[PDB]
Amino acid sequence: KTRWTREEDEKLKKLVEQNGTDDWKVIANYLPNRTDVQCQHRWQKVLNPE
Ligand code: NA
Numbered sequence: 455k456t457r458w459t460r461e462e463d464e465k466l467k468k469l470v471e472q473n474g475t476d477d478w479k480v481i482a483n484y485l486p487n488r489t490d491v492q493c494q495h496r497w498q499k500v501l502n503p504e
Pocket residue numbers: 482483484485486487488489
């Protein structure tokens with residue numbers, strides 16, 4: 455239940471740009487306390503502000 459920080463969002467965006475989205479476990483590996491699913495969901499949100 456940890457809120458997302460701007461630094462996390464930026465890291466998330468760059469991690470996806472460099473690695474792609476075929477493996478969310480790779481992306482999550484670099485975001486402490488964030489799982490693959492949490493990273494995919496956040497990414498979808500940052501792409502289109504709900
Ligand atoms: Na993680």
